Design a protein around this ligand. Structure first.
Ligand SMILES: COc1nccnc1CC(C)C
Length: 148
């Protein structure tokens, strides 16, 4: 079974626990390149009543994302103001996130593919490339980080 965070049947509790950054994508590639502030390696998502605690490394980094007024959307302050949703997850293998960052009057889109294991199948990675395409993000702006 698959779900979107904005969908009626989304079960947020089911995204709790271990996750790993597998692929990141951005319409501003610099943000996820070697010195980019968004080249972050997820470790876990802790689901709370009205928020998600996101644990990364990039040193250890912890972030609290709060529910917004629209179901399935969360906001967090990090290098600007961010809002994100989860357009597709199967809970047990993969999680695809779409994030909008606003900083200094500008914006960019970040997309992420996260896995329960430190890597994912090529088929799932292809589905992620398709989702990026739907959001106007070129494959050349998709960076596989599973070997990094
Ligand atoms: C600030 O968020 C992020 N930063 C870097 C990579 N991925 C995300 C998305 C979260 C939802 C896992």
């Amino acid at each position: 079974e698959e779900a979107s965070s904005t969908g009626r049947n989304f079960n947020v509790e089911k995204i709790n626990g271990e996750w790993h950054t597998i692929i990141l994508a951005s319409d501003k590639r610099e943000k996820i390149e070697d010195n980019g502030n968004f080249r972050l390696f997820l470790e876990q998502i802790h689901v709370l009543e009205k928020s998600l605690v996101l644990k990364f490394h990039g040193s250890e980094l912890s972030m609290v994302a709060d529910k917004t007024e629209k179901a399935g959307e969360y906001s967090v302050t990090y290098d600007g103001f961010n809002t994100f949703t989860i357009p597709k997850t199967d809970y047990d293998n993969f999680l695809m996130a779409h994030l909008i960052n606003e900083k200094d009057g500008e914006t960019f889109q970040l997309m992420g593919l996260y896995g329960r294991e430190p890597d994912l199948s090529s088929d799932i990675k292809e589905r992620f490339a398709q989702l990026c395409e739907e959001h106007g993000i070129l494959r050349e702006n998709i960076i596989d980080l599973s070997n990094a």
